[model samples]
Target: SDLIPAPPLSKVPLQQNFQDNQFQGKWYVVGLAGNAILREDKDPQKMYATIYELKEDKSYNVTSVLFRKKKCDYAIATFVPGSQPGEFTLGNIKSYPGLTSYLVRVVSTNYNQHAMVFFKKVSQNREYFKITLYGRTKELTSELKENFIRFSKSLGLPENHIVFPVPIDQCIDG
Candidate 1:
């Protein structure tokens, strides 16, 4: 329904080393800008609380507020090594049993940039849902933005599919 336009390739640079961009640390969403309507969590205090962490083992954890009830939902993810260095294997919350909405993808060092192409078969329908850009700091540098755009293109992601979050007035450092 809501579609975010990807930035033009001209705005991006060539791809860099994926291993060098190992994602490890805490990341907070400072802004979102796109056509998709953001769902609000029921809890007023938890409305904007979203966090993600990537471990050295290539595993990740994500926590976000459920828009309706303000309840927190979390997932554990690990990227499976693919035929190529950048390929990933994805799985989420083993307890869910049938919840297969997960994919193994790569993200940049600052946690502000990313481009994911679903590897799992079930992910086909949600390809456009890839996270094109994110930031660990409140302010994003022009270099990081360009890096994200290029990375997305490498994944065969179109420039017009990205959805960005509206800018936040105050940013959380670290």
Candidate 2:
């Protein structure tokens, strides 16, 4: 963990009422930001996609892919819901040790126009934070960019870490 001081992460206010069906689908990331664990500057912006398949008991089989360094790195995880409506506890994360993380439905629109998901993880005293704004298409109108940024800022993430990922038009799948 870095010795540098960091701001206390504010209480994340997730979307109050989440509709599972609408949230279950492949989502293209429009905005992204992170450090080494989830990002390596393979691209100036981290271009990736995530697919969530609805399961019994409102759980999901999550498949996420990142196009980086001529390789498409991906991982699949089973997300079991917690007590809250939009909270989740991820299973089968054996790739790393001392890591416990959850998924939260920070915000989303109807049937996949735009959505924002929050992911936070703590491993070996280092806190990894990533906020992804998923959009139906790469081209986001001025109106939606405003909305994505507005909600992203509300989560108390620093502006310097915010990254608007470039589209992965050329990276071939691994």
Q: Which candidate is the best by lDDT?
A: 2
Q: Taking the candidates one at a time, how many backbone clashes does each contain?
A: 14, 0
> Which residue pairs show backbone clashes in model 2?
none
lDDT of 1 by residue, 89-125 (tens): 5544354555555433444343334332222223223
Off by over 4 Å in 1: 1-16, 20-22, 29-58, 61-72, 92-103, 107-129, 142-161, 167-174
Model 1 accuracy (lDDT, Cα): 0.42
Put down candidate 2 lDDT per residue, 73-119, tens digits, no spaces.
77878888866776777776666688765455454555567777777
Q: What does candidate 2 score on TM?
A: 0.78
TM-score of each: 0.46, 0.78
Candidate 1 at residue 173, lDDT?
A: 25
